[PDB]
Amino acid sequence: DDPIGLFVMRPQDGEVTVGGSITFSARVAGALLKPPVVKWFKGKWVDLSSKVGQHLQLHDSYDRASKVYLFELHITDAQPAFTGSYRCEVSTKDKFDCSNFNLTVHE
């Protein structure tokens, strides 16, 4: 099957009800002197780090035992406009990867 890129685990499609909360995440193996770096997007160009607040938070962590980096995107009090196409981009010193996923907000 397909070549192994940077994602140990890719972000998945998600569904949430209006007012609900949902987490998206990515895992990357550290094997690397510096942590991989993540960016989350809505559409081609909206950088969600610019959108952090009552409805959106980001959290990055590392598990020493497994040497895996975890990147989380938390959406809270979901609104209908949050529906759509999203993307996770990860960089290391040597590689770049990305992964597309969708959010659907119901009700």
Swiss-Prot record:
Provide the Ig-like C2-type domain boundaries: 3-105
Q: How is it modified after translation?
A: Substrate for phosphorylation by PKA and PKC. Reversible phosphorylation appears to modulate contraction.
Record: residues binding Zn(2+): 57, 59, 72, 74
Q: Which family does it belong to?
A: Belongs to the immunoglobulin superfamily. MyBP family.
Disease implication from the record: Cardiomyopathy, familial hypertrophic, 4: A hereditary heart disorder characterized by ventricular hypertrophy, which is usually asymmetric and often involves the interventricular septum. The symptoms include dyspnea, syncope, collapse, palpitations, and chest pain. They can be readily provoked by exercise. The disorder has inter- and intrafamilial variability ranging from benign to malignant forms with high risk of cardiac failure and sudden cardiac death.
Functional summary from the UniProt entry: Thick filament-associated protein located in the crossbridge region of vertebrate striated muscle a bands. In vitro it binds MHC, F-actin and native thin filaments, and modifies the activity of actin-activated myosin ATPase. It may modulate muscle contraction or may play a more structural role.
Spell out the protein name for this chain.
Myosin-binding protein C, cardiac-type
Natural source organism: Homo sapiens
**Gene that encodes it:** MYBPC3
Q: Which residues of the full protein are shown?
A: 151 to 258 of 1274
